[PDB]
Structures are given as C-alpha cells and as structure tokens.
Amino acid sequence: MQSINFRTARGNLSEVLNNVEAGEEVEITRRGREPAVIVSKATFEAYKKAAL
C-alpha cells in the first residue's frame, strides 16, 4: 500500500488511477487530516460483498 500526499494525488491523479487500476492500494495523506484510500471499485465491492 503506497502512501502519497495531497499535492501529488491532485497533481498526478491520472497516474494514481493507473496504479490503482493495476490493482494497487494508494493511501492519500493530508496535512492535519485523516488519510483516505483510493482503490479499484471491483476490489472494493468484492471486499464489501465478502464482508456482507
């Protein structure tokens, strides 16, 4: 799980989505905020289905 900052997430969003489509899990950190995660929807929905 790669960690990246906001400036990069925004400035490089196209390449981040590529990394993600390839199956990578990307954490976006923000100065003074909770971290988010970007991931493939299929994977995410698969996790959600499995949990449900």
Place this chain on the structure above:
Amino acid sequence: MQSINFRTARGNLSEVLNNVEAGEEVEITRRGREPAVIVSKATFEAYKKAALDAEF
C-alpha cells in the same frame, strides 16, 4: 521458522525483534492457546496483499 514459548519471548523480546528484522519469522507458543507468529511488517503486508489479490 524458529519456535519459542511465551516466557522466552517476553524475557527476550528485543533480540527476538532483531531476529525478525533480520529476515526471520518467529513462532510464539502458549500453553493451551493457539500459536502466534511475529514477522517483519513489510513481509506481512506483501503476503497479505498477494493472498487478497488471489482470493479477493
């Protein structure tokens, strides 16, 4: 994989972690309990990700 009991681990935790960081996996056994394992974080995340990617 080396195997040690609870007491040995508790009394030697520092060197145990040094062994794990060096590239080793260490099993901790506990009387009447399921065994645990301690492994480098990077190694654990790698295995977990490869397991998920296969299963989902």
Place this chain on the structure above:
Amino acid sequence: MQSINFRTARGNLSEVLNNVEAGEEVEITRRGREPAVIVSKATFEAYKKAALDAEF
C-alpha cells in the same frame, strides 16, 4: 491495524497475544527500527499458502 510501541508490547504481551488469537493484527513499533507484526500463526500460514498457490 492496531499499533503499539515496544515498551507496551513487552509489558502487556499476554493481553497482546489474546488480542491476536481473537483475530487481531498487531503492529509493534520501535524507535529507529523497522516495525514488526504479530498475527495468529494459522492466519499467517493461510496468507502465505494463498500467495504460494497464486504463483505455484
């Protein structure tokens, strides 16, 4: 994942191993060192097994 420092791991190891046996993954951090993970041996074996088999 749950994350604790070395001093805390060593002084609460029994409760840590109980947590892990109940399915919890616990990260142990150390100052100036790489983090370790403690997880049930069964879970870890299954993760790597699933990683092996994915490749073969």
